[PDB]
């Protein structure tokens, strides 16, 4: 039974820096007959399928940038990215294909970037949703860094905690920022029972929150 | 391909014979069963397995583990 | 390396167990002089060895060899007049007898 | 040229079987292997099994007890069958070409999402998010569907750089997500911006034009 | 695709052409091929004789004293590789005392993977100077091509 162990579980690096990650197999993957290692490295970008980067431990797959170098033999292997690009954000897996196939746990590569304030957008419920008897107030907080952000909802000036759903996107492949949606769901009746709706975002970027709001009446 | 640079397997040219196949006559990949059939067709050369190759006889210092 | 080549020639030595052309039965001799042959011409010579002729010949596999005779001195020298005609339009028709018997053929 | 595509049911009842078909093109199944790999939500890649050119198979010693891999060489299709699924079998299932002896798995299918649940398949209600009274951000709320996934595009994919499609949130056996698109003010509402939402499991595909408010 | 036909074992074909038809369906000869000592054969015997399925020989090809054979272009039109796993005294190709052979004509022969070429004592043999063996063998240093037309 071949066990593949990857380290570190994750690493953060700014664009341009060198990165190294390890893969260790419980059994030697070196084939006597050709003195090659039956080991491969895959890259899996968020929401995409895995892409082969390296095979035979050191052979780079067609169309793979020279930035990626595989090294090691027997049981200890390394993947190195000489100068990380923003686009390299992904989970890197090693696989042994000696006899049957086994994947490692993966190494998540994250990007460090300059701090960035979020772009805040607020949306009243759709007239179509209101016709159906529902009312979802959406607030988007886009393109910010670091990931930690705090969103507060206010209805008629008072804070609302109940009924809020938040979702964060994966780090952006091009600008290395994060985005998040915050949805406040109410019944149409409950929605029509108030006038002012506010979405307030607090980030390391400012002490004063980024505020967006609207009045139902308008 | 009209012919293979390395080895032949399942209508394809391959770099090496991967496990669980064996290198045969330094050009094709064969399974255990094939190598076994050659061995028993003798029972000339009773074929053996060594270093991922199906070969006529054991190298010097080696003997046939009968079963496998 | 020379004894790999020695054994090679020896391997084939060991592997080695109607129409009429001009011939000659060469008695008590290990040479032949083939006379009356066409100038600068190649020939196919089949040589065999025989240890019986009397009650039916008993002979060797052929030893095949080929050779071209030497050429003649003036065989290719064009003879007879170099003749000419000149047409109304001053075109010159040169004429010469090709060399009837040359060294191979004239190219 | 080289392609693989998985055809799954998307939702499996607990203790029922899963059947998938991987249809391939651009290479012969007689010369290549096909592997099956799964990825549970937010987890790694797990190798399930493989089928060699000569039809013989290899399975993951765990899943071996309830997994079958067969193929039809003439139809260029490979089959996965998995007995008595449980919650933990919920994952995205991929088929991948294995040019054995030369490369490891090189060509991967886009994958097929399988959800193991008793819950009923429910199509989403798609709502346009136009802003109230340089750039403008618009959105699309995709609410009350099951199971995952949904595909969201903007102007059938014409719009891509300014797009953010948020992970769905599950509340009461129904998922909801939102997608935003940021476009130049000069392009909207003067030019149409449409959100295109597909929910394969319910065989629904809807378009919602984002219309300005009064 | 690759090898549609059979894999056949090596053969030593002597005296008459009868056994030669055993190569009928071979795409690969897993062994050597020797054709020798055919003294009664004439061109007529070769006019309708062809093995277009033969693509490769794992060991060596040897031709010695085969009468009436003037070219190999129709015998082995598609022979592409001679691997030379086993050799005849260091040679992967041997053409010797082929009385009547005018050309090799192995127009599909691209590679000799191991071993050298020995072409000797073929008094009618031409189209040798026209072959660039450096395209077929890594080392032509050990070739022995002499005493031919
Ligand atoms: C004919 O085809 C072969 C196909 O690979 C061409 O490459 C030669 O391949 C042989 C193995 O098939 C190599 O030989 C090996 O060399 C190593 C030492 O380097 C030795 O350890 C092995 O025992 C074996 O002898 C050979 O190096 C390699 N040569 C080159 C230049 O690639 C060959 O070149 C082809 N020739 C022509 C003229 O097309
Ligand atoms: C193990 O190998 C045998 C023999 O393989 C055949 O011969 C090889 C040299 C090569 O040419 C292979 O591609 C051949 O298949 C297998 O037996 C054959 O099985 C096929 C069906 O898959 C059948 O049509 C053939 O007639 C069989 N031929 C013989 C000679 O038996 C056998 O299936 C293999 N077993 C396993 C477990 O892989
Ligand atoms: C060359 O092959 C032909 C065709 O048969 C094929 O080869 C067999 C070994 C087997 O794999 C068949 O399924 C293939 O179709 C042989 O010719 C035929 O031989 C059979 C008897 O074996 C006879 O019934 C047919 O009528 C023959 N057909 C023709 C057109 O001749 C042939 O004998 C094989 N020769 C050699 C040397 O292998
Ligand atoms: C071919 O040679 C064999 C002996 O090797 C002989 O028995 C057979 O009759 C010969 N056939 C022909 C057609 O020459």
Automatic annotation (TrEMBL), chain D:
Cystine pairings recorded for this chain: 140-195
Domain of life per record: Eukaryota
All residue ranges annotated as the Ig-like domain in the record: 134-211
Segments crossing the lipid bilayer: none
The protein, known as: Anti-H5N1 hemagglutinin monoclonal anitbody H5M9 heavy chain
The species this protein was found in: Mus musculus
Stretch of the intact protein here: 160 to 240 of 463
């Amino acid at each position: 039974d071949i066990v593949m162990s990857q380290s570190p579980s994750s690493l953060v690096v700014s664009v341009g820096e060198k990165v190294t990650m390890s893969c260790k197999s419980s059994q030697s993957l070196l084939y006597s007959s050709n003195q090659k290692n039956f080991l491969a490295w895959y890259q899996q970008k968020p929401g995409q399928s895995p892409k082969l980067l390296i095979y035979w431990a050191s052979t780079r797959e067609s169309g793979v940038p020279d930035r990626f170098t595989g090294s090691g033999s027997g049981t200890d292997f390394t993947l190195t990215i000489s100068s990380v690009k923003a686009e390299d954000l992904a989970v890197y897996y090693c696989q042994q294909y000696f006899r049957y196939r086994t994947f490692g746990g993966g190494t998540k590569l994250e990007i460090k970037r300059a701090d960035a304030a979020p772009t805040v957008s607020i949306f009243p419920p759709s007239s179509e949703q209101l016709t159906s008897g529902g009312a979802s107030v959406v607030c988007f907080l886009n393109n910010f860094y670091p990931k930690d952000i705090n969103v507060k909802w206010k209805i008629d000036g008072s804070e609302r905690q109940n009924g809020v759903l938040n979702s964060w996107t994966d780090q952006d492949s091009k600008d290395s920022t994060y985005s998040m949606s915050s949805t406040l769901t109410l019944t149409k009746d409950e929605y029509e029972r108030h006038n002012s709706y506010t979405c307030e975002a607090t980030h390391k970027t400012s002490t004063s929150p980024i505020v967006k709001s609207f009045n139902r009446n308008e | 391909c009209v012919a293979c640079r390395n080895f032949y397997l399942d209508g394809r040219c391959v770099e090496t014979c991967p496990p669980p196949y064996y290198h045969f006559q330094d050009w094709r990949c064969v399974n255990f069963s094939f190598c076994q059939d050659l061995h028993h067709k003798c029972k000339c050369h009773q074929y053996v397995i060594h270093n991922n190759k199906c070969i006529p006889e054991c190298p010097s210092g080696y003997t046939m583990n009968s079963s496998n | 390396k020379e004894l790999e080549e020695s054994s090679f020639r020896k391997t084939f030595e060991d592997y080695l167990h109607e129409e009429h052309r001009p011939f000659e039965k060469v008695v008590n001799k290990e040479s032949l002089v083939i006379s009356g042959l066409r100038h600068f011409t190649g020939y196919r010579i089949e040589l065999q060895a025989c240890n019986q002729d009397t009650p039916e010949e008993r002979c060797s596999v052929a030893a095949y060899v080929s050779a071209r005779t030497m050429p003649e001195a003036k065989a290719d020298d064009i003879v007879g007049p170099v003749t000419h005609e000149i047409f109304e339009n001053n075109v010159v028709h040169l004429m010469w007898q090709e060399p009837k018997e040359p060294n191979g053929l004239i190219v | 040229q080289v392609q693989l595509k998985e055809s799954g049911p998307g939702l499996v009842a607990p203790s029922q079987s899963l059947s998938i078909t991987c249809t391939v093109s651009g290479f012969p199944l007689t010369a290549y292997g096909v592997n099956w790999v799964r990825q549970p939500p937010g987890k790694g890649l797990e190798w399930l099994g493989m089928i060699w050119g000569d039809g013989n198979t290899d399975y993951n010693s765990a899943l071996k007890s309830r997994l079958s891999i067969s193929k039809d060489n003439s139809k260029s299709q490979v089959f996965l069958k998995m007995n008595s699924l449980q919650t933990d079998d919920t994952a995205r299932y991929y088929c991948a070409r294995d040019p054995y002896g030369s490369k490891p798995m090189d060509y991967w299918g886009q994958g097929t999402s399988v959800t193991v649940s008793s819950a009923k398949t429910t199509p989403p209600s798609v709502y346009p998010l136009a802003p109230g009274s340089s750039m403008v951000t618009l959105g699309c709320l995709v609410k009350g569907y099951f199971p995952e996934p949904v595909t969201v595009t903007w102007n059938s994919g014409s719009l891509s750089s300014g797009v953010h499609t948020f992970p769905a949130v599950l509340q009461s056996d129904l998922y909801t997500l939102s997608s935003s698109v940021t476009v130049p003010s000069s392009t909207w509402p003067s030019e149409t911006v449409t959100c295109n939402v597909a929910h394969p499991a319910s065989s629904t595909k809807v378009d919602k034009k984002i219309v300005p408010r009064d | 695709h690759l090898y549609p036909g059979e894999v056949c074992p090596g053969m030593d074909i002597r005296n008459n052409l009868t056994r030669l038809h055993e190569l009928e369906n071979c795409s690969v000869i897993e062994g050597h091929l020797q054709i020798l000592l055919m003294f009664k054969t004439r061109p007529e015997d070769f006019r309708d004789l062809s093995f277009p399925k033969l693509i490769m020989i794992t060991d060596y090809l040897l031709l010695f004293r085969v009468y009436g054979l003037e070219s190999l272009k129709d015998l082995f039109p598609n022979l592409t590789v001679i691997r030379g796993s086993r050799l005849f005294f260091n040679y992967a190709l041997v053409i010797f005392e082929m009385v009547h052979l005018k050309e090799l004509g192995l127009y599909n022969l691209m590679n000799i993977t191991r071993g050298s070429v020995r072409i000797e004592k073929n008094n009618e043999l031409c189209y040798l100077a026209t072959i660039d063996w450096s395209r077929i063998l890594d080392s032509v240093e050990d070739n022995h091509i002499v005493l031919n037309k």
